[PDB]
XYZ file of C-alpha atoms in Angstrom:
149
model
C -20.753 -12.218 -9.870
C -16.898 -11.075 -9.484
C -15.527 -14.230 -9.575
C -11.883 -12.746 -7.878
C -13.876 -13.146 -4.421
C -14.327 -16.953 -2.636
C -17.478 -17.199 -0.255
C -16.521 -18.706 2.673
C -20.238 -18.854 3.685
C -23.639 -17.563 1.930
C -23.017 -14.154 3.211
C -18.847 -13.606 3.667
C -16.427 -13.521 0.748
C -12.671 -12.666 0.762
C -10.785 -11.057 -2.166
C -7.668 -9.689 -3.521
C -8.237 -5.659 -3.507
C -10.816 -4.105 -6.269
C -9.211 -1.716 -8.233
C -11.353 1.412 -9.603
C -12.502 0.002 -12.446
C -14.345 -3.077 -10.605
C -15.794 -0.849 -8.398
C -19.606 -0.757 -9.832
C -18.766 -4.395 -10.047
C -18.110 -5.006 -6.672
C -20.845 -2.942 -5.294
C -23.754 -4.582 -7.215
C -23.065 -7.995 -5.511
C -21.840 -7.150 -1.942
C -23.185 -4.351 0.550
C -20.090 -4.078 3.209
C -16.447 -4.205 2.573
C -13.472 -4.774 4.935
C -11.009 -2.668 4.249
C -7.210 -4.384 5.395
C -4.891 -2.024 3.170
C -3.583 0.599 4.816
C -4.649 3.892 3.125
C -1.525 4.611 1.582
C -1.828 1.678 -0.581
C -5.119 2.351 -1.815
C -5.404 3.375 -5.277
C -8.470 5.307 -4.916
C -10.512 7.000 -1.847
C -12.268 4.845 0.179
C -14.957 7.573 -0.481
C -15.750 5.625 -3.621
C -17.366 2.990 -1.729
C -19.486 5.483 0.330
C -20.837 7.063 -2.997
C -22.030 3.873 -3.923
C -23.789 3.049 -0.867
C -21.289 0.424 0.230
C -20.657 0.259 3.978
C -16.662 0.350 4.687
C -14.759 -1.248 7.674
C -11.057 0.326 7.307
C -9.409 -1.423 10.057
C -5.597 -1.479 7.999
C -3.165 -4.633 9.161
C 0.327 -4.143 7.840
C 1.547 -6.262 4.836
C 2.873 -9.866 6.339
C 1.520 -8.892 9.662
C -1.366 -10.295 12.142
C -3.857 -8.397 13.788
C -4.220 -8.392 16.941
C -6.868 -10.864 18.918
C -8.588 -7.441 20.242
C -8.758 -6.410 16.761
C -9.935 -9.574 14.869
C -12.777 -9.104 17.453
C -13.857 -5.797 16.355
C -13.936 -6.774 12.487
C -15.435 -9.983 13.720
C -18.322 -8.161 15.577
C -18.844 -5.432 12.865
C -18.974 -8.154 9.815
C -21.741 -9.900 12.005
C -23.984 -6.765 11.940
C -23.434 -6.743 8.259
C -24.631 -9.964 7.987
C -27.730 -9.986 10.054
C -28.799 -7.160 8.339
C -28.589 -9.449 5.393
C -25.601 -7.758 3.961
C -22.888 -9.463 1.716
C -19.586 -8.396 3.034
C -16.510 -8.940 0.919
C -13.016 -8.809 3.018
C -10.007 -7.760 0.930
C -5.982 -6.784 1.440
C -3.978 -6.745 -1.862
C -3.010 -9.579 -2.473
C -6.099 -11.907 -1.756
C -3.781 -14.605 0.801
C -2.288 -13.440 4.163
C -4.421 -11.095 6.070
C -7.732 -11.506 4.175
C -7.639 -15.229 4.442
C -6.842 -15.048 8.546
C -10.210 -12.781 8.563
C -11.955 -15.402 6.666
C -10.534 -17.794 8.582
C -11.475 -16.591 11.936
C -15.263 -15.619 10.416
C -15.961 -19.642 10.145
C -14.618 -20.360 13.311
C -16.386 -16.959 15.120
C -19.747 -17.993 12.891
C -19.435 -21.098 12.465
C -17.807 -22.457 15.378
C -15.246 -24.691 13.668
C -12.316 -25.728 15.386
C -9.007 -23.760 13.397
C -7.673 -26.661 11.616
C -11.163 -27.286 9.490
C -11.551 -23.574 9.330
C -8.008 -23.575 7.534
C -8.411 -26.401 5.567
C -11.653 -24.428 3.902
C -9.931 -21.239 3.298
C -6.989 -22.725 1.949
C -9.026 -24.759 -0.375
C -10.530 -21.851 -1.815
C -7.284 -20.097 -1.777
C -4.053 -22.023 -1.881
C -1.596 -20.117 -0.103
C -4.230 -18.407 2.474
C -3.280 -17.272 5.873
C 0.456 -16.874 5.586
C 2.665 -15.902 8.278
C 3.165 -17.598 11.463
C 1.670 -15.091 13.034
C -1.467 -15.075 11.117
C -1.410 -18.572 12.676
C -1.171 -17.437 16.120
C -3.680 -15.629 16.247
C -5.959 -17.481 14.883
C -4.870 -19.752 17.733
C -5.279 -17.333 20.547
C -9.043 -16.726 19.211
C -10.025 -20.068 19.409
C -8.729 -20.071 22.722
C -10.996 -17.082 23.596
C -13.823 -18.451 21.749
C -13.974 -21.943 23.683
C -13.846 -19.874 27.163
């Protein structure tokens, strides 16, 4: 395996971003990535992941920002698919902490159904220093708000 990613579950993993040469690497043990980096920080096309047969999600979320609830919901909903068609999906930004870790954390608590301060607690575990920025927080908040409605 590429022991940079940290399964949060059997199927969901989040990362600090591949570079080119773990690419081959990368592909042989997961089937979908989500893409957080916008595209002008990307050292390579994301084409390179299509050539390989590796389904992309590029949804981009600026450095030290949140997403918004509407668009956790869409990665949310597309790394489900992945997953039921028995897909491993690795989740990266650059640096492996802030955004990637706020998608991870909202996967347990969207999959899982576990309240945000256990879903934290995990992530953090496997990453000290995971989910950042108070607004990462907030977010995270506002979705388990929609998810107990």
């Amino acid at each position: 395996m590429w022991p940079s990613a940290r399964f949060v579950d059997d199927n969901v993993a989040f990362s600090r971003m591949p570079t080119e040469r773990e690419l081959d690497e990368v592909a042989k043990d997961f089937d979908a990535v989500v893409v957080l980096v916008e595209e002008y920080e990307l050292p390579y096309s994301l084409e390179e992941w299509k050539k390989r047969g590796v389904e992309v999600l590029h949804s981009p979320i600026p450095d030290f920002t949140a997403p918004s609830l509407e668009q956790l919901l869409e990665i949310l909903r597309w790394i489900e698919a992945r997953v039921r068609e028995g897909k491993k999906v690795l989740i990266h930004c650059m640096g492996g902490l802030g955004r990637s870790g706020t998608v991870a954390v909202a996967w347990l608590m969207y999959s899982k159904g576990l309240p945000l301060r256990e879903a934290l607690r995990r992530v953090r575990s496997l990453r000290p220093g995971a989910v950042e920025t108070y607004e990462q927080m907030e977010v995270l908040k506002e979705l388990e708000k929609f998810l107990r409605s």
